[PDB]
Structure formats: C-alpha cells, structure tokens
Amino acid sequence: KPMPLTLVEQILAEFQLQEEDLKKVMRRMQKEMDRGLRLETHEEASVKMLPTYVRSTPEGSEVGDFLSLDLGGTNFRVMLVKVGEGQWSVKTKHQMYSIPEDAMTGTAEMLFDYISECISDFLDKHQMKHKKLPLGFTFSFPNNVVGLLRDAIKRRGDFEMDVVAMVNDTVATMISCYYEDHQCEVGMIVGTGCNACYMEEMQNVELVEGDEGRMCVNTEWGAFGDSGELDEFLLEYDRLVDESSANPGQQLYEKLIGGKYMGELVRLVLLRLVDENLLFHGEASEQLRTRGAFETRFVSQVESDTGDRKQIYNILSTLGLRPSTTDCDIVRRACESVSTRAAHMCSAGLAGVINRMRESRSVMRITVGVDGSVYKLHPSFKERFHASVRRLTPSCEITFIESEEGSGRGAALVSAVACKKACMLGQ
Ligand SMILES: O=C(Nc1nccs1)[C@H](CC1CCCCC1)n1cnc2ccc(F)cc2c1=O
Numbered sequence: 001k002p003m004p005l006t007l008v009e010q011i012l013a014e015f016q017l018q019e020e021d022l023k024k025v026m027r028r029m030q031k032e033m034d035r036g037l038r039l040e041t042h043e044e045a046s047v048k049m050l051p052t053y054v055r056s057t058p059e060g061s062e063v064g065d066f067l068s069l070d071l072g073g074t075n076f077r078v079m080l081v082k083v084g085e086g087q088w089s090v091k092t093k094h095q096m097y098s099i100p101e102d103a104m105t106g107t108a109e110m111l112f113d114y115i116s117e118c119i120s121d122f123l124d125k126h127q128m129k130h131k132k133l134p135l136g137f138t139f140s141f142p143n144n145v146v147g148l149l150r151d152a153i154k155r156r157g158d159f160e161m162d163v164v165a166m167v168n169d170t171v172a173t174m175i176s177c178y179y180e181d182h183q184c185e186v187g188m189i190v191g192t193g194c195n196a197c198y199m200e201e202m203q204n205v206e207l208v209e210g211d212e213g214r215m216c217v218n219t220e221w222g223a224f225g226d227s228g229e230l231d232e233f234l235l236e237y238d239r240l241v242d243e244s245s246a247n248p249g250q251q252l253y254e255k256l257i258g259g260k261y262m263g264e265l266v267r268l269v270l271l272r273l274v275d276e277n278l279l280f281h282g283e284a285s286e287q288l289r290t291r292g293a294f295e296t297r298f299v300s301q302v303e304s305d306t307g308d309r310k311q312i313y314n315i316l317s318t319l320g321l322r323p324s325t326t327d328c329d330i331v332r333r334a335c336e337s338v339s340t341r342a343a344h345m346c347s348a349g350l351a352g353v354i355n356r357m358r359e360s361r362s363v364m365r366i367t368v369g370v371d372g373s374v375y376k377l378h379p380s381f382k383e384r385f386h387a388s389v390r391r392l393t394p395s396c397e398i399t400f401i402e403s404e405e406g407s408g409r410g411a412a413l414v415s416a417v418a419c420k421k422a423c424m425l426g427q
C-alpha cells in the first residue's frame with residue numbers, strides 16, 4: 001500500500017473506535033438490556049428485550065403436521081412438514097411453483113389468490129384437505145404476507161387453514177442455524193436494519209413467570225442510543241443522517257450500523273473531503289450532493305475492488321464524477337472507515353449479549369447464527385466483525401454460521417417453531 005495522504009487520514013480517523021470505546025458501548029448496551037428484561041423498567045426501556053415465547057423446551061406438542069411456505073423472488077415452495085422424535089426429525093414433501101406474469105404484475109390480492117390456488121392443488125395432491133393445517137412463512141430472497149394469505153384463503157372458502165404469525169427475522173436466523181448446529185443460541189441480522197436475539201435464562205426474563213430453562217429474547221437493540229448512550233461517538237455525518245431521517249433521535253444504534261444509512265454516511269464523508277479540497281479537486285457532482293445517491297450497495301462494490309480501481313471508477317462515473325486514481329483510493333478508504341465502524345459498533349452489541357450469556361450461565365462455547373445483506377455481501381465486514389467480537393469476549397469460543405438453504409429443513413424448523421408457538425399461545 002502507498003503512504004496515504006495525511007489530511008485524508010485525519011478526517012477518516014474520526015471513525016476509529018478503540019477497545020476502551022467499544023467496552024464502554026458494550027457496558028451501556030448491557031445496562032439497557034438489563035432495563036428491558038426487568039418488570040419494573042421494561043415499559044420505559046428503549047431496548048425492549050421482547051420475550052419471543054420460543055423456549056428451550058419443546059412446546060405445542062399437538063402440532064405435528066404443518067405447511068411451510070417459502071417465498072423466493074419469483075417463485076415459492078409449498079412444503080408439508082411432519083416433525084417427530086431427543087432431537088426432532090423433520091419429514092417433508094414439497095413443490096416449487098412459478099408465479100406467472102399475470103399473478104406477479106397485478107394486485108397483491110390476485111397474487112395471493114394464485115398462491116392459495118397452488119396450496120389447494122398441493123393439498124389435493126397429498127390428500128390433506130381433511131385437516132386444518134397451520135402454515136408458517138419463510139423467506140429466501142436473493143399489507144403483509146400473513147394477512148394477504150389469510151384473506152385469500154377466506155376468499156376461496158373451500159379449505160380451512162391457519163396462517164401463523166411469523167417470528168422475528170433474528171429468531172428465524174437462530175432457529176434455522178440451530179437446525180444445522182445445536183449450539184446456536186444467538187441470532188443476528190446485519191442488513192438494512194440490525195438486531196439480535198438470544199436464549200436468555202428464564203429467571204432473567206421477568207416478563208414471563210418461571211425460572212426453568214431458557215427463552216429467546218428479541219432485543220430490538222436498534223433503539224439503543226435514545227438517552228444519549230452513543231452521543232460521545234456520534235460524528236457530524238451521523239447527526240446529519242439522523243436529522244434528515246424519518247425518526248430523528250430514534251434508532252441511533254441502528255443508524256450507525258444498518259445498510260439503510262451506510263451509503264448516506266459515506267456520501268457525507270465524501271462531501272466533507274470535497275469541501276476540504278481533498279477529493280475530486282473540490283468539485284462534487286449534483287448526484288453526489290443528492291441525498292441517497294450513494295447507495296449502500298456502492299459501499300460494498302467499492303470495497304470489492306480488486307486493486308485496478310475499475311469497480312470504483314464505474315460507481316463514481318455513474319455519479320457524474322471523473323475520479324483520478326487517488327480519488328478512487330480515497331473513496332475506498334472512506335467506505336472502509338464507515339463499514340469498519342459499523343462492524344465495531346455491531347460487535348459491541350453482540351459482545352454485550354455473549355458476555356451476559358456467559359455470566360448468566362457461569363469458558364463458554366456458543367454458536368451465533370447471522371444473516372443480512374451487510375454481513376453477507378459486504379467484503380470483509382464479517383471478518384472485521386468476527387475479529388472485534390472475539391476481542392471483546394475473552395473466555396468465549398464463538399462459532400459464526402450462516403443458514404444453508406440445504407433441502408429447506410432449517411426453514412421448515414422455523415415454521416415448526418412458529419406453528420408450535422401459535423398453538424401454545426392459543427392463537
Ligand atoms: O421449538 C422450540 N421451542 C418452542 N417454544 C415454543 C414453541 S416451540 C425450541 C426452539 C429452539 C430454538 C433454538 C435455540 C434452542 C431452542 N426447539 C426447536 N427445535 C428443536 C429441535 C430438536 C430438539 F431436540 C429440540 C428443539 C427445541 O427445543
């Protein structure tokens with residue numbers, strides 16, 4: 001690597017977070033998680049620590065047979081599932097259906113009429129119209145669906161079917177990863193938003209009576225920062241993003257991490273560098289000066305550049321810029337600075353959860369299931385994230401996994417849990 005321009009590095013170094021900074025954040029997050037779990041303070045807590053009712057012990061045992069409906073981009077899978085017996089066997093049969101142009105381009109109602117017709121055909125094929133099966137949705141993308149399907153089934157009026165509430169995406173991640181690795185007790189998403197769930201000791205889940213076993217808690221930790229917990233770490237860019245957001249003052253933690261805001265943060269950093277005459281010869285394009293024009297996907301593409309600067313040039317050319325080679329290199333480092341800080345901030349949260357779990361259970365081996373566009377698509381984000389988390393979690397051995405599509409059985413397990421939960425809750 002070349003000797004970087006000192007004045008650029010001074011600006012980009014603003015994003016640095018030292019171990020002590022992350023430990024401070026981690027401790028603050030842990031106090032907010034405490035606040036969310038306790039009966040006395042839950043109502044006012046910003047980090048809600050929602051009980052998911054997904055317990056460490058099997059429940060809804062009367063749910064044996066169910067449907068799982070996996071929504072892809074332009075097709076879907078209907079799957080009939082039987083969960084049986086000491087670890088669960090997940091027995092399946094399924095069918096892929098292509099969504100025709102007709103059904104994909106009309107109203108959501110018409111689309112779900114078509115989906116319902118396919119379910120009907122599927123149940124006819126497998127001679128299952130004698131049962132009112134529960135159905136859970138899963139998503140495998142490269143108005144809400146529960147309601148649309150519920151309405152469409154009512155519309156048909158020929159077979160009865162319950163559509164169960166979906167679990168949170170973090171919970172779905174944990175469950176699907178658990179299918180592959182039974183030490184998975186944490187689910188996390190780093191996509192457009194950022195969130196985590198984990199298996200909390202029932203004694204600490206004060207919102208649900210009982211001290212036996214564990215229950216998954218959905219932290220909804222994106223809301224962290226409400227009372228200034230992150231203020232000392234906020235940069236001018238963060239303040240601007242927040243001020244122009246739909247919910248100023250809220251979701252400040254998520255605003256530091258999520259793909260919703262990452263590109264915009266980079267844009268503002270680039271404009272700062274332009275204003276200081278360190279980038280594009282002090283001349284920004286009209287596109288560069290337009291809110292939202294630097295898409296988060298551009299950040300990942302810039303960091304994917306192989307060294308020839310062609311990926312970076314193509315992004316910047318699209319923005320009406322004619323970057324020099326130095327301009328391209330600076331943009332890469334600006335992207336790296338923002339994404340690294342996101343990884344650092346995210347690691348403080350997960351570290352807080354993991355260290356809490358270790359002390360609640362009193363060295364800990366644990367698997368963390370992770371999904372989301374940023375974690376998956378962003379070059380080296382997961383690697384930087386992993387390294388930081390591990391640095392903050394001494395005496396824990398953390399394995400990170402991503403759900404493998406496989407034969408859809410991980411997704412089937414998500415639906416099993418969703419259906420069993422709905423049964424347990426009297427829905
Ligand atoms: O289904 C469960 N709990 C429910 N609560 C309410 C309705 S169903 C838990 C969930 C898992 C999730 C991952 C962490 C450990 C508990 N679960 C899931 N899948 C399993 C598969 C094999 C096995 F031997 C046990 C379980 C199990 O307890």
Ligand SMILES: OC[C@H]1O[C@H](O)[C@H](O)[C@@H](O)[C@@H]1O
Nearest residue numbers: 168169170189193194195222
């Ligand atoms: O998509 C990841 C996360 O985004 C937001 O934080 C949502 O509030 C949360 O429910 C979800 O888990």
